[PDB]
Amino acid sequence: GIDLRWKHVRSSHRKAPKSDNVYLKLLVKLYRFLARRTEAPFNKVVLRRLFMSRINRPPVSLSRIARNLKNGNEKKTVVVVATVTDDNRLLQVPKMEVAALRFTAKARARIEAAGGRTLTLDQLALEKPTGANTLLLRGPKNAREAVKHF
Amino acid sequence: SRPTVTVFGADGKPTGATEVLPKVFSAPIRPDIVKHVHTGMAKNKRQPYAV
Amino acid sequence: IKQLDAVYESKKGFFLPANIVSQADLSRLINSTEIQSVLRAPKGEARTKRAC
Amino acid sequence: VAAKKHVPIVKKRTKRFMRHQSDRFKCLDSAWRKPKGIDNRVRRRFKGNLAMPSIGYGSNKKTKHMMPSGHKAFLVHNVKDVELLLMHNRTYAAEIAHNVSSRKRIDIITRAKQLGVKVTNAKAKV
Amino acid sequence: PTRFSKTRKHRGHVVGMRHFHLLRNHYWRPSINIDKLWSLVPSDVREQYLSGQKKDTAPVIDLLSHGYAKLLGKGRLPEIPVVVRARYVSAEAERKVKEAGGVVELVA
Amino acid sequence: SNVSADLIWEVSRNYNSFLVKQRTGTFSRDALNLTNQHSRKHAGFVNDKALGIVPAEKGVKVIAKKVKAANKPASSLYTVTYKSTARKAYKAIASQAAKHGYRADLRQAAVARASAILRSQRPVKPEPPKKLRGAAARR
RNA sequence: CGGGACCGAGGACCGCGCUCUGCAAGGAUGCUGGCGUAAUGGUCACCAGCGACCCGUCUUGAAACACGGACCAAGGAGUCAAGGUUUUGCGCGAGUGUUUGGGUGUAAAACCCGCACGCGUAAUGAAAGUGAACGUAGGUGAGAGCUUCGGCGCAUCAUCGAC
RNA sequence: AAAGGGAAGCGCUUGUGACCAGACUUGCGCCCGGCGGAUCAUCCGGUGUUCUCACCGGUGCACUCCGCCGGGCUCAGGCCAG
């Protein structure tokens, strides 16, 4: 016998989505290829967020995007791996290029009416395969009723 | 332009008429959503039983 | 087939959903020039020789 | 035809795993059940007792599900079923299902002879 | 469904005051902040107002028709004159409407 | 668009009507499936370019998908019957599988399937009589 | 320099090398004999050598005591509803929820409709009541990622302010 | 059919007796000889296709192809062993 006071630890993170969405499976295959064959850390972070559950992908609003588009970020491509929602408190939407997992109808309409562009993540993979000149944004994780109750 | 689809006659031959393909045929194909809705929907005609 | 579009326009509160993937051809995306031109060189083959 | 070349077939254990006390009680089937009593000698693995099944007895992955001829059994119900083995006559052998009639068995055996496919139970219903 | 339950796997191993006759309709006064005020305007005319295609006309917003009784004062307004008809209003909300160039009218 | 070979494979990789699943392997009944095995490489009904070989009365009959007629099933197949020397059949099948980039990964399986069908079309030899063995069977 | 035992995993080539026409160098080949069948192999019954308490329950720390078991077949015990809570998948998203009801129907299905309503979008106080931007929605230290290589800084955390 | 000098039953391993499942029976490739036929190569026309690959009709006049039958040779073949 061998004395092993320490214990080998199995992985405590997701390695695959629990979702059965076929298009998400295709996206996961594409970003597995990109994070294996490139050196860009952007692709690895994107792959990990594609694995995540919905409470780990809180929505990002247009006012949050407009806040982060200030101070030299007006030309960077915004990348969100969750839903982008509309904020009707934001009366003037700036021009922006946003790639998201999905958009709400009003958010897509307001971005296109302001003159920006909405992209899917596979179009993002085509145009920026190394994540150059991008702004990777997350929504508020702890802004949940249960997390308040913790 | 949008794609077209051929109209066939009663003899099985094309009539020369075409129609624009509706946009619903380009909808995403989601078997997980279809399975969830089908599992729910197939129980809606059930009659109750009890001893 | 001519009435189908009006059928789907008349559904209140529903729009035809947007997909999370724009191009479903994964082979076309992966073997496109935009992705292939920036990849690192392969670090191995599909089969690995046994060393010792 | 002869099977594809393979490593020798090794069975780590050929004897079955008999249920404890099924030799003494007729109401107990011999099929294996794990003893769950806290003081059970088979569960505690005292020597001289029945062995318990475990993953260490597992067969070689290269020879799992191989019959001694080197083929893998594939159950067939008709001629179209046996025609699925057209590209696998060196790896798969056809076993005709028990409820297939004698005439259909004759048809299956003739087609499998043409395809060069071994039939495991070719002499039944003759 | 019964086949997914853990039981199947475990087979083989087992102050203040009291208010009598409270009528909630007395205390009905839903509130809306001024940062949501323009969302009550329909989208097309709202877009014309925010762009600047209506320089000689002002919108009149009836909060009671939208189901609100009090205008509260969270947020900021654009520099567009708005007439607001409300049953109640906070001091900050009235101040911000007046700086925007409109007027808060009281209704019942 | 919304439809591709990858999408169809993700839709039908776990179940379809051609699937034959048993303990010793998973097989496919698909006509455009050489080797009759369930995989993306051999799923001819899934793939945009695909080949399939069936026996004829004499020789083989090879079908190939036409990429411009995928929505027209009655005119989607390019069909050639080879009833000639086996070497000529192998040459033409390998040519339509590899010379123009139409599934060069399938040319070994296609030539093998044609050879198997032509071998099965030969007359069968009579088997030797069964030798009786032991004591109870012999007597 | 002899003598003996057990073992032969892998399966085109690629490597490290050497005594370099080649090799003992990233895992056994070559030569030969008998037999080609119950001979090898397997199952069952029995003898032989060695091994081996009767199961379940209960109790305590444990045994022991005690309790149940003549035998076999069939039956036989964590279910359903309402309401919470956390987590997973899905739709829509500052909204969301067609199915009380109405329309319709190939008629207990499916499809369609909307007023009200519920929950959320504002809190706090016993109550009367009042009600959330000084500032690119603040300062400072971190922080993935991006960067024009000067910086910009997500989530989140810590700390000082503001309403 | 068998066992039995105050229990049987069970585990590991031989042996005896009884009873069995497989495997094997030859295949592939060459070199000769004899048959039986021209779905040999090239060219022409049509058709289809992956647009350069095929099929079909004419052309072969037998040192070319395709089967069959006799030999000879190489290789690979079952079980236990030296």
From TrEMBL, chain A:
One GO-annotated biological process of the protein: translation
All residue ranges annotated as the Large ribosomal subunit protein uL15/eL18 domain in the record: 1-150
A molecular function GO annotation: RNA binding
Superkingdom classification of source: Eukaryota
Keywords linked to the UniProt accession: Ribonucleoprotein, Ribosomal protein
Cellular component terms per the entry's GO annotation: cytosolic large ribosomal subunit
Family affiliation: Belongs to the eukaryotic ribosomal protein eL18 family.
Name of the protein in question: Ribosomal protein L18-like protein
Record organism: Chaetomium thermophilum (strain DSM 1495 / CBS 144.50 / IMI 039719)
Full-sequence portion shown in this chain: 31 to 180 of 213
TrEMBL record, chain C:
Residues forming coiled coils: none
Family that this chain belongs to: Belongs to the universal ribosomal protein uL4 family.
Protein name (database record): 60S ribosomal protein L4-like protein
UniProt signal peptide: none
Superkingdom, taxonomy of origin: Eukaryota
TrEMBL record, chain D:
Residues engaged in binding Mg(2+): D39
Alphabetical UniProt keywords: Metal-binding, Ribonucleoprotein, Ribosomal protein
Top-rank taxon: Eukaryota
SUPFAM superfamilies for the chain: Ribosomal protein L32e
Keyword Ribosomal protein in annotation: yes
GO biological process: translation
GO CC, alphabetical: cytosolic large ribosomal subunit
Record GO terms (molecular function): structural constituent of ribosome
Family: Belongs to the eukaryotic ribosomal protein eL32 family.
Protein name: 60S ribosomal protein L32-like protein
Automatic annotation (TrEMBL), chain F:
Molecular-function annotations in GO: structural constituent of ribosome
Keywords for this protein: Ribonucleoprotein, Ribosomal protein
Residues annotated as domain Ribosomal eL28/Mak16: 7-120
Residue ranges, annotated region (Disordered): 119-139
Keyword Protease set for record: no
Gene Ontology, cellular component aspect: ribonucleoprotein complex; ribosome
GO process terms (BP): translation
Pfam families in the cross-refs: Ribosomal_L28e
Coiled coil (UniProt feature): none
Family membership noted in the UniProt record: Belongs to the eukaryotic ribosomal protein eL28 family.
The protein's name: Putative 60S ribosomal protein
Source species: Chaetomium thermophilum (strain DSM 1495 / CBS 144.50 / IMI 039719)
Organism taxonomic ancestry: Eukaryota, Fungi, Dikarya, Ascomycota, Pezizomycotina
